[PDB]
């Protein structure tokens, strides 16, 4: 039980129900004074959900650049990775890693997708439905191609970064048979542009909660109907979790979403957990023993054994860069 991944935020974690695959993210190197120290691109860490042990694999092939904020999912044992932030900025590249392989070395493949891709961006979300991947939102450059939806600049990026960036409300579909991008024509009122929101799919509903937009970290809840492309805003019956970004939102049943952690508008790291019951349209607080372990920019993955496995993220205000306390702890929630 020696092996364990380095601490990190902004990594991805995806699951086949038995394994949790962890890639990427960043941490600090305090000796060198580096607070954007990306984790090694060729490493893939596998957390075995039954044994609680980690194994590090070195991948080959078209290994993606080291990145924070990428959007990944595992569908039928294939890892798909879109977007992110590397040392030279945001990307819209798409990578696949097929784990249905009896080869001893796992191989990344960079895919040349057809159609018009999303803009280059990070800190977004993805829904999975009927052999397609449906991406929503994010933070990145002004879109350069014809795109349906809206984009709003982050005002401070006109002086605080080398190139202006902003939030989008875009919905893009990738068909994984042909690797073709498209966009659906939606109806209803889409959520505002946002990044660092959390997405979760139950049935044909793509839920999205919270996120950052302009000067707010939000607590609104919406779903996109993945058959009809109608957006719906859900107004819960009572008290809601406070507005936040960098939280996780994970399906735990056919009727429940599990929310943990995040970062408030006033920059407080959060250790609260809640369950949203879909049929009752109500939020309920979830009692747990990690009240002194707030996390933001962690990942959460459900196991087949009725648990949510939280990994990584930052315990304190990650925007105070030199003091940001990234974690490598596994927090297990019994749901």
């Amino acid at each position: 039980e020696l092996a364990c991944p380095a601490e990190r935020s902004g990594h991805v974690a995806v699951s086949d129900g038995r394994h949790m695959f962890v890639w990427g993210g960043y941490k600090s190197n305090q000796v060198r004074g580096l607070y954007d120290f990306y984790l090694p691109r060729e490493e893939l860490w596998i957390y075995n959900m039954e044994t609680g042990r980690w194994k590090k694999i070195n991948t080959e092939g078209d290994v993606p650049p080291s990145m924070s904020g990428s959007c990944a999912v595992c569908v039928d044992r294939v890892l798909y990775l879109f977007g992110g932030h590397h040392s030279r900025g945001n990307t819209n590249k798409f990578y696949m890693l097929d784990s249905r392989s009896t080869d001893r070395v796992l191989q990344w493949e960079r895919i040349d997708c057809q159609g018009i891709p999303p803009s280059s961006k990070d800190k977004l979300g993805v829904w999975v439905y009927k052999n397609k991947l449906i991406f929503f939102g994010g933070y990145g450059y002004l879109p350069e191609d014809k795109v349906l939806g809206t984009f709003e600049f982050d005002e401070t990026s006109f002086w605080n970064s080398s190139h202006p960036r902003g939030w989008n409300d875009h919905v893009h579909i990738l068909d994984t048979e042909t690797f073709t991008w498209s966009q659906p024509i939606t109806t209803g009122k889409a959520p505002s542009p946002r990044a660092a929101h959390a997405c979760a799919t139950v049935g044909n509903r793509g839920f999205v909660f919270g996120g950052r937009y302009r000067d707010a970290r939000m607590n609104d809840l919406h779903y996109l109907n993945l058959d009809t492309w109608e957006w719906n805003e859900l107004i819960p019956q009572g008290i809601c979790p406070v507005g936040r970004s960098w939280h996780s939102l994970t399906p735990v049943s056919s009727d429940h979403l599990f929310l943990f952690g995040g970062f408030t508008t006033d920059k407080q790291p959060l250790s609260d957990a809640w369950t949203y019951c879909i049929s009752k349209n109500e939020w309920i607080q979830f009692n747990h023993p990690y009240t002194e372990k707030p996390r933001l920019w962690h990942t959460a993955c459900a196991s087949d054994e009725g648990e949510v496995i939280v990994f990584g993220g930052c315990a304190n205000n990650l925007l105070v860069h030199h003091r940001a306390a990234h974690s490598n702890e596994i927090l297990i929630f019994s749901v």
Partner: peptide, 7 residues
């Protein structure tokens, strides 16, 4: 730190 902007 560009990586954390926008969240």
């Amino acid at each position: 730190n560009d990586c954390s902007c926008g969240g």
